[PDB]
Design a protein around this ligand. Structure first.
Ligand code: DXS
Ligand code: DXS
Ligand code: HEM
Ligand code: HEM
Ligand SMILES: *[C@@H]1O[C@H](CO)[C@@H](O[C@@H]2O[C@H](CO)[C@@H](O)[C@H](O)[C@H]2NC(C)=O)[C@H](O)[C@H]1NC(C)=O
Ligand SMILES: *[C@@H]1O[C@H](CO)[C@@H](O[C@@H]2O[C@H](CO)[C@@H](O)[C@H](O)[C@H]2NC(C)=O)[C@H](O)[C@H]1NC(C)=O
Ligand code: BOG
Ligand code: BOG
Ligand code: NAG
Ligand code: NAG
Ligand code: NAG
Ligand code: NAG
Lengths: 552, 552
């Protein structure tokens, strides 16, 4: 009965009720006017007419390899293009943040309470007649129905971009510092109060936890040596709380910043590499600063590791994801003459579309073994038996699954995929096409346009009837991918703004932080500005095995 | 022994130790280069040579009243100047913030731990040979000595700008939402985790406290009616914790957002006015929105009162303090085409220089009574006996004390002034002249230049010997005022950047918040944009008594 239930305001105008059965659209600064903010202003007609489609742009970025080769080798030109990449979409992220699961209007509670994920689109009001607002049936289609017909893997569909398990586990490890749902409160709540790349998954969310992980000598983190190899300490040594099944022996209860990282040895692998990396930087900083104490060595190392992470995510991780020939660049100075907010609030929808479980293989292939999920989960003895070098060599070779294109979620984690559907609904997510409009994309006009094929589309059309009732999460997983790409348009276009905002919004990218002395001088600064996935593994994994985010 | 103890880097360059007895200055983006960042670049020589002094600017802003009268009546010209006021100094405040009492270098702990006040200048390192670094004696002069010789009031010195008790209590009430020192942790720690104008002094710092204060009808706050007049509820009714001496009767233990506001009836007066204003706005919003619930009425009213507060502070409160003929303006749109960070972290030094206790009179004169401090403190029966109208009429007529110029701290609060000295030292504040340099002011070259007279200057010279060892806090209260002004140059030039940053950095000034629907439509928006101290009192105090921030 809320008069705004039909989402009547277009072009990011805001709907407000003006009585029981009337509404008003606030078209302030949308570029549009009129009752529903649908009449474009003159300057808006022009730019709309001159704006290429995302699929047109994606074509240009993935072709003309020779032209892009020239651009990359002209620092001024590459800088200019990367600068546009960073600012072109800032208008798409509300910063400071606005809505959350409990607030469809702006409020001081929504702005100030950091325990919420923020929301790119307000929730559908509780009293709306249908889950998507006014369209569709009283209830959305059975989520198990949707799961089985279009989401579950039949046969493994490999990623055509060649993502490997180093990438898959890097994505899982990296994202689990800011996707940390507080299930004691609900799916719209997080425990990552830093709301970004603070490396709490290495150092701990709280000071108490951090101090239990620290050696308090030379800035270093505690560690144990097993078979000549450095691994994280135990729960017994540190008193750090970790999530482990009751049968895990004490000497295998490794303690790391993130309490769930004992769930899979792929995560413990990266937890071990980054712990080693922190202590390596401690040695470097102590050599440069014999006069420094333990506290300053730890803090400066932490700042450098934050920088390395952002460097790797942009220039290796996103670079791989994009398939662009243009070489992305981590350069905070590109924003110094630009309007940009050095802050971030993690959006629920960003969490939702980062649910890349189709990446997971049917078995995890380390050396000559092929572990099933049951053997793999919560089993750190695999990491000790094979070691990090063999983990890297094996995971560099093993292909990851395709995420878009449908029917590639391994049934081992079908409960998680069903929870993504159920809890998206619980959080009153708007429809896929509302989210498409919110990120300047054309609404899909049929299920076949969404999938690009006929069979999944037909199953989805029988379940949903109307395309405007299609839900965001399943749509991402069934969407037609870009040509030979891992993702469809919606994933890239909705996820990229959150992603870059979460990286460039970090305080170390602000002008007063982005200078050598923040990082202990030019030597510490250079560790950030030369980091890579290859060198991260090379400095911290015995034998310096080759690695990358794609197979071969 | 720290090689940076002498603060060798000038012009906001950063000092870093490079060994036990060597340092390096990071001159990045300071406009200077060289070992100590003292060699100006060419563009810097130019702007330095074209920059008027703050006392020259102050002269122009307080004279040529005829010319300023023309500027004020040209909206485009007034906007352009106000825009410069807001941004001209943007650069003086580290945002995102940097140092705090425990960190003289940038660290993730210092960035992320909101329980700290931030620091405009890093603390003097613990191992420096002298309290100011390397200058001065082993110990700073006896704080009792300083207090008695140059700070304590002999005879009441009135403010020549005519500040009254409406102003002094507005300053106390307003600032005590973000100056809330956590004495359980130490002077460098705050309990105002919002770090700004969130009106927690009305609504409570925590949700638990806010909900005990709320009526949960029509968005309103709980209240009682005493003699036909609306007052805050009691501790007994609400269970809201308040600080009161044991002898206060239960029916006089008024409960308000800020737990210390029973300290003086001057605070409870404003607590009551703002309580009435919140519920007044609730009535207005309910009339515009019969379809709204209690929660949306409460949240929208709170946002409007935040807007009213900022409006009043800029256009009435700062306007009065400045003595400018130019009319300052609260207009968030002025920053929309400007680089600006919509965030704020409350600085310790901002707290320190807002210690305006010389404002206080020797007695509080309400109607025909003259209450001493002992009679006035923790005595809400005074507020009930006279009522709000008589409070307003009396406090509008009573003159406040001059803040700069020396010897005007009332003896009733001498323990507070001595604590300001002692805790500035505990927090390892740098010297007055270091803070002057940090805010682009010339160091004082003698005590007589600081005070502008001879007797206090000689007093201080016997205590401190060297001017470069003079402390920030005593200097503000003994400083030579501007001609017939309440403050000296240091107070204004250091405090104005923090002040405007805390006001404009608020999220409601950001583009996505600053639009009518955030505030329930044009009617709620208009409440912000027409607010004034006079209308605040007129709508909420019986009889609409005249008020202002100056006498007569
Ligand atoms: C492809 O696959 C991907 C996949 C993921 C991607 C990206 C690309 C990108 C790059 C991007 O953001 N790509 C659009 C640039 N479009 S653009 O800047 O608006 C633009 C518009 C018009 C012309 C342009 C242009 N010219 C000169 C034609 C050059 C460059 C940009 C132009 C980022 C950040 N990803 C994420 O990290 C990310 C992480 C997690 C999730 Cl879930 C989702 C994404
Ligand atoms: C006077 O007493 C006061 C006292 C307190 C004041 C102010 C003025 C000011 C106004 C301001 O900030 N005054 C600098 C103007 N100048 S610039 O630096 O803005 C500038 C530079 C060069 C030329 C200019 C120019 N033209 C036309 C030549 C026009 C306007 C500005 C120009 C504000 C905010 N304070 C605080 O809130 C306040 C709150 C608590 C604390 Cl303890 C301390 C301060
Ligand atoms: C390798 C084996 C993996 C397993 C066994 C697994 C399993 C799970 C489970 C059970 C959850 C629900 C968490 C909870 O409710 O407490 C979850 C959530 C999630 N998964 Fe995975 N996952 C794996 C890999 C990945 C990968 C490769 C990604 C790629 C990005 C990913 C992305 C996510 C995200 C973002 C969440 C949300 C976490 C949160 O909100 O706290 N996962 N996963
Ligand atoms: C009217 C009677 C006033 C009394 C009795 C009074 C008393 C005090 C006392 C005892 C403190 C120390 C409290 C503590 O350490 O926790 C204090 C702090 C303070 N007072 Fe006043 N004061 C009054 C008015 C003012 C006024 C007019 C201002 C002007 C802005 C002001 C600004 C401050 C500030 C900034 C602090 C430091 C607050 C903090 O860190 O928590 N006070 N006052
Ligand atoms: C942030 O918001 C959540 C949601 O309202 C708050 O959590 C509630 O807190 C109350 C007590 O104040 C509990 O009775 C509820 O059970 C909590 N609900 C949920 C869903 O957790 C939380 O307290 C807020 N945090 C802050 C810092 O204000
Ligand atoms: C912010 O920093 C303060 C100061 O280090 C932290 O307070 C300390 O917390 C430990 C336990 O973690 C106590 O043993 C100390 O007594 C506390 N010291 C002081 C001076 O309060 C505080 O925990 C930090 N806050 C966060 C959120 O990490
Ligand atoms: C030099 C300019 C060349 C521009 C090439 C444009 C190619 C557009 O490319 C096509 O766009 C469609 C839009 O939906 C997609 O459906 C197709 O898959 C995509 O390949
Ligand atoms: C691996 C999990 C499969 C769940 C089977 C339940 C019914 C699934 O459903 C059907 O699956 C068929 C075979 O793939 C498809 O051809 C149909 O389009 C689909 O509706
Ligand atoms: C605006 O939208 C409503 C339904 O959402 C529609 O009935 C109305 O006619 C629209 N108005 C205009 C001018 O398009
Ligand atoms: C854990 O992995 C080891 C190999 O390192 C294997 O022998 C064992 O069976 C696994 N445990 C479970 C419960 O699968
Ligand atoms: C820099 O300052 C130090 C002391 O702080 C001084 O000894 C040195 O001569 C200065 N160097 C220059 C180039 O001015
Ligand atoms: C409190 O104020 C009343 C006047 O309202 C006065 O009679 C009483 O003496 C005061 N109490 C104290 C303890 O001073």
């Amino acid at each position: 009965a809320n008069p705004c239930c039909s989402n009547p305001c277009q072009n990011r105008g805001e709907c407000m009720s003006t009585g029981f059965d009337q509404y008003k659209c606030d078209c302030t600064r949308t570029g549009f006017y009129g009752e529903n903010c649908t009449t474009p202003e003159f300057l808006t007609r022009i730019k709309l007419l001159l704006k290429p489609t995302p699929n047109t742009v994606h074509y240009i970025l993935t072709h003309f390899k020779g032209v892009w080769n020239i651009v990359n080798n002209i620092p001024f030109l590459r800088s200019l293009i990367m600068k546009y990449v960073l600012t072109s979409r800032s208008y798409l992220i509300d910063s400071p943040p606005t809505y959350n699961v409990h607030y469809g209007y702006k409020s001081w509670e929504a702005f100030s309470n950091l325990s919420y994920y923020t929301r790119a689109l307000p929730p559908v009001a509780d009293d709306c007649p249908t889950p998507m607002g006014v369209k569709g049936n009283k209830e959305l289609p059975d989520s198990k129905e949707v799961l089985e017909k279009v989401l579950l893997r039949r046969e493994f569909i490999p990623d055509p971009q060649g993502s490997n398990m180093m990438f898959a586990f890097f994505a899982q490890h990296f994202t689990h510092q800011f996707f940390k749902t507080d299930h004691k409160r609900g799916p719209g709540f997080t425990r990552g109060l830093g709301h970004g790349v603070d490396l709490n998954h290495i150092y701990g969310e709280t000071l108490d936890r951090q101090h239990k992980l620290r050696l308090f000598k030379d800035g270093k983190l505690k560690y144990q040596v097993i078979g000549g190899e450095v691994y994280p300490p135990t729960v017994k040594d540190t008193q750090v709380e970790m999530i482990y099944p009751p049968h895990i022996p004490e000497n295998l209860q490794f303690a790391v910043g993130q309490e769930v990282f004992g769930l899979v040895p792929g995560l413990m692998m990266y937890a071990t590499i980054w712990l080693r990396e922190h202590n390596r930087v401690c040695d470097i900083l102590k050599q440069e600063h014999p006069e420094w104490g333990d506290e300053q060595l730890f803090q400066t190392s932490r700042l450098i590791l934050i920088g390395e992470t952002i460097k790797i995510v942009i220039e290796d991780y996103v670079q791989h994801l994009s398939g662009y020939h243009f070489k992305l660049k981590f350069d905070p100075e590109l924003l110094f003459n630009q309007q940009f907010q050095y802050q971030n609030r993690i959006a629920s929808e960003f969490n939702t579309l980062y649910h890349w479980h189709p990446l997971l293989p049917d078995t995890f292939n380390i050396e000559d073994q092929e572990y099933s999920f049951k053997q793999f989960l919560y089993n750190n003895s695999i990491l000790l038996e094979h070691g990090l070098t063999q983990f890297v060599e094996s995971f560099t070779r093993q292909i990851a699954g395709r995420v878009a294109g449908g029917r590639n979620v391994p049934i081992a984690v079908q409960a998680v995929a069903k929870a993504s559907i159920d809890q998206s609904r619980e959080m009153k997510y708007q429809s896929l096409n509302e989210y498409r409009k919110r990120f300047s994309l054309k609404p899909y006009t049929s299920f076949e346009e969404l999938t690009g094929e006929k069979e999944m589309a037909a199953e989805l059309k029988a379940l949903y009837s109307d395309i405007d009732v299609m839900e965001l999460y399943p749509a991402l997983l069934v969407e037609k991918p870009r040509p030979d790409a891992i993702f469809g348009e919606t994933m890239v276009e909705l996820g990229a703004p959150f992603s870059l905002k979460g990286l460039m919004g970090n305080p170390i990218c602000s002008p007063q932080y982005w200078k050598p002395s923040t990082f202990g001088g030019e030597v510490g600064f250079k560790i950030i500005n030369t980091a890579s996935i290859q060198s991260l593994i090379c400095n911290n994994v015995k034998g310096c095995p080759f690695t990358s985010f794609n197979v071969q």
